[PDB]
Design a protein around this ligand. Structure first.
Ligand SMILES: CC(=O)O[C@H]1C(=O)[C@@]2(C)[C@H]([C@H](OC(=O)c3ccccc3)[C@]3(O)C[C@H](OC(=O)[C@H](O)[C@@H](NC(=O)c4ccccc4)c4ccccc4)C(C)=C1C3(C)C)[C@]1(OC(C)=O)CO[C@@H]1C[C@@H]2O
Ligand SMILES: Nc1ncnc2c1ncn2[C@@H]1O[C@H](COP(=O)(O)OP(=O)(O)NP(=O)(O)O)[C@@H](O)[C@H]1O
Ligand SMILES: Nc1nc2c(ncn2[C@@H]2O[C@H](COP(=O)(O)OP(=O)(O)O)[C@@H](O)[C@H]2O)c(=O)[nH]1
Ligand SMILES: [Mg+2]
Lengths: 429, 161
């Protein structure tokens, strides 16, 4: 079978995985020690996709934690699952990027990437055959912006034909948590357009609206924000782990969901999402989940999908279902909302049916769309970018680290072409 | 050897956009009873070998400007015109030693006119001021025929005569 290498960059990224790796082990029934105590054996059938075996019945997650620049490190070790990682995989350095891109990609990355790329090739040859390189990081910051994109330039070079997903937490257009946030967006995405197969563009403001308007929560903590993102990750590799009546490879997604080799910037989605005690006044069916998935306030993208056009969508369904109901609900949406989509594409929807739901639920789903509604987001960042650069605002923290003025002009016109060539296809042609 | 040559590119632009009224030691240096004059030493052969850059303009007879390189808030080079209105602005090239005579002429009168005609020599180390009052004017071995005091200590006996 195929196996997946999992990489974490940035202060954001490993905090995502710290909840996420708890979810996968609870999806199979694995202790903090690695002792398997699941219920059935059906979850044992694809342990190998993430977990390799150890000496006495122990399973080790193949997670290479690049981002443990030492302050972030001990928290991961002093967590719920600090006693589950192989401690030699904690690959890190000292005196980090400091929310500087060039300190992530040009100066301190060169003093760490040789210690990283070797550990990549360690877990690589322990696999039968590879496809999976799940980088978990954010844009906007430091390590996730400069040290994250450094590996994607390198691991593509050693592995030219492997599936490359980066579940990058994008910047927010209103809540700016970083002063240099447009300067880290334009540079890091300039790597991502060149050498990614897909990416899950995620905002926190979309996570803010979902936790508050839909889940009705008072105080959303970052463990609870990312638990929404952790639901996306396990839903996609559901079929590469569980037997489904219409399976879903990452590459089955990564041939269907992408028309053109550059336009592979995805927005995720998830359902069910509700606020209750234990009595909730609804009923789980196929059209129950379907209407929830296609909602403009149920996006993890922070954009109106009705403003843009859906190029293509992906309905990855879990749990026991019925294909005709699955087929016709995807049919009825493309009928009643045909003016929304890209009209000159024959089918605008595909399906994917796993046969096993998660633990608590009885049915579930995972929306993955690719739209010209994400044309808004880079427009909401490149305008923030181009106001800083004309006044030449933060250059002396970048030119004094090994960068150049001609690099910035080269950086945005890459991003200026995406919003240009999303306007070609949001237009009715 | 090779400092920033664009330093000098900054200099020459102010030069070729204006009039310049130089000043030499071949003119009647009029009287005011008071002044503060200027005279610089020539650029040495060593400084040329090290590519020392010009720093002065002599735009006028009674004014001088310094060429100071500076930097802005984006590390962009800036040049300052230290506009110094003075009385007498002589060049380092025009040292014919009549500067003392042109300085002595008003003073050689005063004491003989019954007055107190004084002076002072002010300058930096290595600025050529021992070559400016203590003499002698050759710049090689201080040849004992051009004692700069003697250019009016002659007057002490000659204007006496
Ligand atoms: C009585 C009952 O049915 O309770 C549900 C529940 O009330 C709701 C509200 C759950 C609840 O989820 C949340 O409140 C939540 C908290 C942080 C981040 C995201 C969600 C639930 O906590 C979450 C929990 O989810 C699971 O058990 C899934 O297997 C889920 N597991 C985890 O996320 C997980 C949490 C802690 C430790 C280990 C795993 C999962 C989802 C996708 C992929 C893998 C696992 C469920 C169904 C419930 C509770 C318990 C209240 C909901 O979430 C999920 C993920 O199912 C929130 O909206 C759904 C709808 C559910 O009905
Ligand atoms: N106006 C001038 N024209 C030509 N050569 C000059 C002039 N002034 C000084 N020099 C030469 O510059 C050199 C240094 O001059 P000098 O008068 O010895 O300097 P200084 O100011 O007395 N230095 P110092 O005694 O070390 O504090 C000598 O070789 C001079 O002959
Ligand atoms: N979703 C999420 N975003 C985070 C988290 N921590 C930081 N961020 C975001 O990540 C960006 C800051 O980068 P960060 O990862 O902390 O910097 P780094 O350690 O230099 O990579 C900002 O956009 C923050 O809003 C997190 O735990 N979850
Ligand atoms: Mg001397």
């Amino acid at each position: 079978m195929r196996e997946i290498v999992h990489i974490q960059a940035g202060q954001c990224g490993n905090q995502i995985g710290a909840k996420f790796w708890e979810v996968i082990s609870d999806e199979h029934g694995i202790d903090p020690t690695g002792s398997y105590h699941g219920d059935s054996d059906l979850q044992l059938e694809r342990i190998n996709v993430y977990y390799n075996e150890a000496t006495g019945n122990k399973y080790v997650p193949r997670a290479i934690l690049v981002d443990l620049e030492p302050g972030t490190m001990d928290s991961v070790r002093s967590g719920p699952f600090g006693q589950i990682f192989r401690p030699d995989n904690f690959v890190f350095g000292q005196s980090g990027a400091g929310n500087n891109w060039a300190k992530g990609h040009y100066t301190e990355g060169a003093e760490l990437v040789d210690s990283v790329l070797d550990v990549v090739r360690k877990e690589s040859e322990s696999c039968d055959c590879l496809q999976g390189f799940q980088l978990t990081h954010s844009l906007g910051g430091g390590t996730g912006s400069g040290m994250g994109t450094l590996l994607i330039s390198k691991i593509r070079e050693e592995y030219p034909d492997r599936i490359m997903n980066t579940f990058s937490v994008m910047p927010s257009p209103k809540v700016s948590d970083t002063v240099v946030e447009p300067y880290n967006a334009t540079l890091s995405v300039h790597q991502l357009v060149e050498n990614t197969d897909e990416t899950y563009c995620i905002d926190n403001e979309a996570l803010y609206d979902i936790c508050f308007r839909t889940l009705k929560l008072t105080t959303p903590t970052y463990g609870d924000l990312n638990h929404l993102v952790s639901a996306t990750m396990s839903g996609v590799t559901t079929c590469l782990r569980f037997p489904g009546q219409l399976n879903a490879d990452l590459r089955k997604l990564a041939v269907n969901m992408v028309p053109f080799p550059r336009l592979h910037f995805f927005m995720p989605g998830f359902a069910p999402l509700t606020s209750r005690g234990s009595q909730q006044y609804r009923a789980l069916t196929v059209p129950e989940l379907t209407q929830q998935m296609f909602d403009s306030k149920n996006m993890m993208a922070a954009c109106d999908p009705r403003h843009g056009r859906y190029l293509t969508v992906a309905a990855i369904f879990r749990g026991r279902m019925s294909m005709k109901e699955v087929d016709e609900q995807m049919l009825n949406v493309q009928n009643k909302n045909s003016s929304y989509f890209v009209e000159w594409i024959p089918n605008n929807v595909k399906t994917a049916v796993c046969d096993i739901p998660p633990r608590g639920l009885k049915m579930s789903a995972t929306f993955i769309g690719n739209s010209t509604a994400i044309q808004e987001l880079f427009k909401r960042i490149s305008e923030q970018f181009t106001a800083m650069f004309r006044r030449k605002a933060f250059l002396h923290w970048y030119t004094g680290e090994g960068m150049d003025e001609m690099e910035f002009t080269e950086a945005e016109s890459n991003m200026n072409d995406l919003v240009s060539e999303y306007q070609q296809y949001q237009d009715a042609t | 050897g090779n400092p920033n040559w664009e330093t000098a590119q900054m200099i020459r632009e102010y030069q070729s956009t204006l009039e310049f009224v130089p000043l030499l030691d071949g003119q009647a240096v009029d009287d005011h009873q008071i002044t503060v004059c200027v005279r610089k030493r020539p650029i040495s052969r060593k400084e040329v070998n090290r590519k020392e850059i010009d720093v002065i303009s002599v735009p006028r007879k009674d004014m001088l400007i310094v060429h100071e390189p500076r930097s802005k808030v984006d590390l962009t080079k800036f040049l300052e015109n230290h506009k110094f209105r003075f009385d007498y602005a002589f060049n380092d090239t025009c040292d014919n030693a009549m500067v003392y005579k042109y300085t002595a002429k008003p003073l050689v009168k005063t004491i003989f006119e019954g007055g107190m005609a004084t002076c002072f020599a002010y300058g930096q180390t290595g600025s050529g001021k021992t070559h400016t009052m203590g003499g002698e004017f050759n710049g090689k071995v201080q040849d004992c025929k051009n004692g700069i005091y003697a250019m009016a200590a002659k007057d002490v006996f000659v204007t006496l005569n």
